[PDB]
RNA sequence: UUGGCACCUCGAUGUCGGCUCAUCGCAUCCUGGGGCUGUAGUCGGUCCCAAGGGUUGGGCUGUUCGCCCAUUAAAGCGGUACGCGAGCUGGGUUCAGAACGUCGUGAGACAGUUCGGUCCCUAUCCGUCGCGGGCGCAGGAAAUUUGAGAGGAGCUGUCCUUAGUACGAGAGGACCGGGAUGGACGCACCGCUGGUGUACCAGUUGUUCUGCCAAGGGCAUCGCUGGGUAGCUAUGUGCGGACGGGAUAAGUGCUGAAAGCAUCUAAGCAUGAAGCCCCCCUCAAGAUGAGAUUUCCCAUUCCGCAAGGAAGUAAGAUCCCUGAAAGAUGAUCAGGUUGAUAGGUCUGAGGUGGAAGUGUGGCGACACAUGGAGCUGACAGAUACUAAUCGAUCGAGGACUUAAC
């Protein structure tokens, strides 16, 4: 995973 | 190269026509220095148009002079003023009909002001 | 200024009508050729009666461009169309007849038979 | 070697002996007065000083007036050295003119190129441009500064800055025509610099 | 640019007739084929007249074998031997870029006799 | 785009070395003074070489 | 590369493939120089020396890879967080929806497939690219410069001769040496070819205004359309990688002994590569090792007994102003009233294309003559008509030893 989807 | 003065080209033309005509009636106006430098060449070109005195030069000048009253209780337009007073006043002089005299900076924006007069 | 994927009409009696450029043969290299250069090309449209068929990968030399070819005397020449003549991998043309005007810059190369078969050399 | 230095006027075209058309650059480069001769026993090298385009006494300083007093001439705007000329062959105060160049010779032309101001990497370094579409927000930018491992940018990374105003030498140009009456040199090809700027024309390194 | 004028005044071709950018004329072009130099005639309408003194150029367009040919000469070149104006046309502008797409009668109805 | 460390007082004062502004080109007015900045009309007397032109 | 271990990070080290920019190592793809060949010549095979330069445009697939088309001198392998997301894209992986196949009673699951799916940051410091202000360089200045060092460039194809010669039964076919013409790249500049050119010229539509016709102005993308000066430009033009020196690598050797011979070596001499150090171009004395040449200004006044410190000034420079061949701003350059720096005026170049008014012909729309006319932004040459006024500020009195004077 390690998805860069910071909001 | 001419200046842009922070305006659109249509706004440039309208402001230059307004300043030219307002200098032509009131004979002494106070603007910024760069507006004076852009205005003086156009004003002496229009005085040169008034020098000829023919109908074609007057119709050329009518496309630039705005329709404001020049002399009160006489019904004189500015276009009549170029061909009646300014041309007869500057008949001998060959160019250099305006001078620019600098003033101090303005309070509100630090703009260097200048005095424009017909000489 | 003939490029890859430029469509040229074919100006001889070989049978092809429209051809599509595959590669300019000069160098590694350039993507543009003007006049007198040989290009590898493939036939897109052709007449039913002719030796050259549709889809054949052939070689052709450019004879006309709308780009202004410069000469040493300061003169310029340009056409209203791009045209080329198909050749048998040497500098001899397929067709027995050549239609349309032909630029003089083919004479600087050893392209004598295409110039001799041309109706007008400018 | 030989050379002379002057001002270029502009470009024109001249056809000569055939139908062929030649791009021609016009240079006013005469007269030049020898101001100072550098000697190896005093200066450490051999060179001559050439002065061009003399000016009014109001624009010249007292050291400038005293430096040209030895050559018996007016103070001059442009002074440059030529190295290495055939020593001696010229005395101090002798006028160098355009008759030293014949109209078939091969010369070196140098000068300060035209200024372009602070320009981006695409114009200054010829770098290729990013895509304008398919979602791309990238164009007209210099690129990645390099890898991660040195923790620094290597020296020589091409970046936007001021373009022009540097000395540019164009090699192996040909003189088309020489005008001894009007002090003009006609040179084949393009010459770096703007109009009425200083152009130095020296003989090429043959062969 | 008066110095450029004094340089190139000796090489101006003053025997050429004056022609407007909207008339048809024939150009006698000397070409070197080896060894004999034939003089081919290039009749066609003038399209361009771009000034500049010695840098003046003019463009002549003709239709040859169904393909239009545009050819541009400098005015004062020695390659042109003789210029004869065939007839004078009546045009409204100095650049005739419109008629290179108007084949064929649509150019004839614009290039009327003057 | 985030400062890693705060600027010390000495580095801030070194950066503020060139933040100062210069004395204007002010000269003696020949009519009254004092004083008058160069190439402008005097605000006191309204004169310029040397007529009262306001 | 696939692995093994789990040392560093889970109060975050963004992970594939592409775009942009590159740099480095040869275990070298080509180009350069060689040895052995079962190398007759061209083309080859293998092994050395060599990183200087260059190592492509597509079709398929998210793809690297791979296959194919067409070239090429060749389309080389790898490292740099499988280089590079505070430089860029999210097509695939890897969220939340919905399906197909399979498994599961089921909720649901699948390196099985498909459709769709929010990529933030105003740069503090070091780094890099440019531009300034100080102080130093034992007096103050204006110019011209040597070069310790550093950067840039470094690539090659095709054709003709030699010569259809050497070689070879033939087919085929040179090494070496000359001369042209190209590709890619780079540096300059518009004089041509074009592009652009929002204060240039003309045509034309709708509405409003100058009381009306005529003639014009405003707005409608610069209203639209056709051209176009200067400047900036490439796709345009000119030029470059040329000829060459020194020490060399792999090789080829000469004279020669250890070892009476032999021997490329242990001493002495060569020859030898697109490697190296120069010749080509550029920045360069903050090169604190601060260099060198030419030419000006001079050696005041007052305190401090010595060191030294204040005021005025010379040579010169600056503040302020007119501007661009320059330019974000500084800076640079041309100039400041014994002068052409800018604007205006006049005359021209170029551009546009035949102004207004009048007259003629026609019912009229319109055409013709006056007339290459009128108009013209930065392009030239003349001309002080206007503005660069008067003014002010900074700027040295030259330390001590040693040899001759």
From Swiss-Prot, chain B:
GO terms for molecular function: structural constituent of ribosome. PANTHER family: LARGE RIBOSOMAL SUBUNIT PROTEIN BL17M, RIBOSOMAL PROTEIN L17. Part of the 50S ribosomal subunit. Contacts protein L32. GO terms for biological process: translation. Keywords: Ribonucleoprotein, Ribosomal protein. GO terms for cellular component: cytosolic large ribosomal subunit. It comes from the Bacteria. Belongs to the bacterial ribosomal protein bL17 family. This is Large ribosomal subunit protein bL17. It comes from Bacillus subtilis (strain 168).
UniProtKB/Swiss-Prot annotation, chain C:
GO terms for biological process: translation. It comes from Bacillus subtilis (strain 168). Keywords: Ribonucleoprotein, Ribosomal protein, RNA-binding, rRNA-binding. Signal peptide: none annotated. Belongs to the universal ribosomal protein uL14 family. It holds the Pfam family Ribosomal_L14. InterPro entries: Ribosomal_uL14, Ribosomal_uL14_bac-type, Ribosomal_uL14_CS, Ribosomal_uL14_sf. Part of the 50S ribosomal subunit. Forms a cluster with proteins L3 and L19. In the 70S ribosome, L14 and L19 interact and together make contacts with the 16S rRNA in bridges B5 and B8. This is Large ribosomal subunit protein uL14. Binds to 23S rRNA. Forms part of two intersubunit bridges in the 70S ribosome. The keyword Plastid does not apply. One of its GO terms (molecular function) is structural constituent of ribosome. GO terms for cellular component: cytosolic large ribosomal subunit. HAMAP family: Ribosomal_uL14 (MF_01367). The lineage of its organism: Bacteria, Bacillati, Bacillota, Bacilli, Bacillales. The gene is rplN.
Curated annotation (Swiss-Prot), chain D:
One of its GO terms (cellular component) is cytosolic large ribosomal subunit. Pfam families: Ribosomal_L3 (PF00297). SUPFAM superfamilies: Translation proteins. Keywords: Ribonucleoprotein, Ribosomal protein, RNA-binding, rRNA processing, rRNA-binding. GO terms for biological process: positive regulation of rRNA processing; rRNA processing; translation. Transmembrane segments: none annotated. InterPro entries: Ribosomal_uL3 (IPR000597), Ribosomal_uL3_bac/org-type (IPR019927), Ribosomal_uL3_CS (IPR019926), Transl_B-barrel_sf (IPR009000). Residues 121-151 are annotated as: Disordered. NCBIfam families: L3_bact. HAMAP family: Ribosomal_uL3_B (MF_01325_B). One of the primary rRNA binding proteins, it binds directly near the 3'-end of the 23S rRNA, where it nucleates assembly of the 50S subunit. Strongly stimulates 23S rRNA precursor processing by mini-ribonuclease 3 (MrnC); 20-30% DMSO can replace L3, suggesting the protein may alter rRNA conformation. This is Large ribosomal subunit protein uL3. The gene is rplC.
Swiss-Prot record, chain E:
This protein is located at the 30S-50S ribosomal subunit interface and may play a role in the structure and function of the aminoacyl-tRNA binding site. PROSITE patterns: RIBOSOMAL_L19. The keyword Ribosomal protein applies. This is Large ribosomal subunit protein bL19. One of its GO terms (biological process) is translation. Part of the 50S ribosomal subunit. Belongs to the bacterial ribosomal protein bL19 family. One of its GO terms (cellular component) is cytosolic large ribosomal subunit. InterPro entries: Ribosomal_bL19 (IPR001857), Ribosomal_bL19_CS (IPR018257), Ribosomal_bL19_sf (IPR038657), Translation_prot_SH3-like_sf (IPR008991). It comes from the Bacteria. HAMAP family: Ribosomal_bL19 (MF_00402). GO terms for molecular function: structural constituent of ribosome. Keywords: Ribonucleoprotein, Ribosomal protein.
């Amino acid at each position: 995973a390690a998805a860069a989807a910071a909001a | 190269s001419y200046r842009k003065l922070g305006r659109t080209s249509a706004q440039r033309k309208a402001m230059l026509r307004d300043l030219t005509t307002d200098l032509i009636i009131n004979e002494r106006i106070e603007t910024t220095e760069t507006r004076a430098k852009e205005l003086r060449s156009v004003v002496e070109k229009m005085i040169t148009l008034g020098k000829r005195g023919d109908l074609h030069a007057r119709r050329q000048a009518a496309a630039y002079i705005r329709n404001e009253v020049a002399n009160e209780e006489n019904n004189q337009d500015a276009l009549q003023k170029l061909f009646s007073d300014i041309a007869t006043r500057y008949e001998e002089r060959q160019g250099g009909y305006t001078r620019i005299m600098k003033l101090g900076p303005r309070r509100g924006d630090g703009a260097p002001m200048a005095i424009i007069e017909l000489v | 200024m003939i490029q890859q994927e430029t469509r040229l009409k074919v100006a001889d009696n070989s049978g092809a009508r429209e051809v599509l450029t595959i590669k300019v043969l000069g160098g590694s290299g350039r993507k543009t050729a003007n006049i007198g250069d040989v290009i590898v090309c493939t036939v897109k449209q052709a007449t039913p009666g002719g030796v050259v068929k549709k889809g054949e990968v052939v070689k052709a030399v450019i004879v006309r461009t709308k780009s202004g070819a410069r000469r040493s005397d300061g003169s310029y020449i340009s056409f209203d169309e791009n045209a080329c003549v198909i050749i048998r991998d040497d500098k001899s043309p397929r067709g027995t007849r050549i239609f349309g005007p032909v630029a003089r810059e083919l004479r600087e190369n050893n392209f004598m038979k295409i110039v001799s078969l041309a109706p007008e050399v400018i | 070697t030989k050379g002379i230095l002057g001002r270029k006027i502009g470009m024109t075209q001249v056809f000569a002996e055939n139908g062929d058309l030649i791009p021609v650059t016009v240079i006013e480069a005469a007269p030049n007065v020898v101001l100072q001769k550098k000697t190896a026993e005093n200066d450490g090298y051999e060179a001559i000083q050439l002065g061009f385009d003399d000016k009014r006494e109001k624009l010249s300083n007292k050291p400038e007036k005293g430096h040209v007093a030895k050559a018996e001439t007016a103070p001059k705007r442009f002074v440059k050295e030529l190295r290495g000329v055939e020593m001696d062959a010229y005395e101090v105060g002798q006028e160098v003119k355009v008759e030293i160049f014949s109209a078939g010779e091969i010369v070196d032309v140098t000068g300060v190129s035209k200024g372009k101001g602070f320009q981006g990497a695409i114009k200054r370094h010829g770098q290729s441009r990013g895509p304008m579409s398919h979602g791309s927000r990238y164009h007209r930018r210099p690129g990645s500064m390099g890898p991660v491992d040195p923790n620094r940018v290597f020296k020589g990374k091409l970046l936007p800055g001021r373009m022009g105003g540097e000395q540019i030498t164009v090699q192996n140009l040909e003189i088309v025509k020489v005008d001894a009456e009007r002090n003009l040199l006609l040179i084949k090809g393009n010459v770096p610099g703007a109009k009425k700027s200083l152009i130095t024309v020296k003989s090429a390194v043959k062969s | 640019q008066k110095l450029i004028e004094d340089i190139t005044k000796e090489q101006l071709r003053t025997d050429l007739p004056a022609f407007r950018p909207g008339d048809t004329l024939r150009v006698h072009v000397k070409v070197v084929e080896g060894n004999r130099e034939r003089i081919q005639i290039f009749e066609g309408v003038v399209i361009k007249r771009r000034g500049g003194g010695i840098s003046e150029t003019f463009t002549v367009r003709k239709i040859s074998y169904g393909v239009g040919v545009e050819r541009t000469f400098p005015v004062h070149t020695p390659k042109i031997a003789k210029i004869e104006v065939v007839r004078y046309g009546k045009v409204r502008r100095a650049k005739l870029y419109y008629l290179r797409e108007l084949r064929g009668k649509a150019a004839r109805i614009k290039e009327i006799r003057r | 785009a985030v400062p890693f460390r705060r600027t010390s007082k000495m580095k801030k004062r070194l950066r503020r070395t060139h933040f100062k502004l210069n004395v204007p080109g002010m000269t003696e007015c020949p009519s009254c003074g004092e004083m008058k900045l160069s190439h402008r009309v005097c605000k006191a007397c309204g004169s310029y070489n040397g007529k009262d032109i306001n």
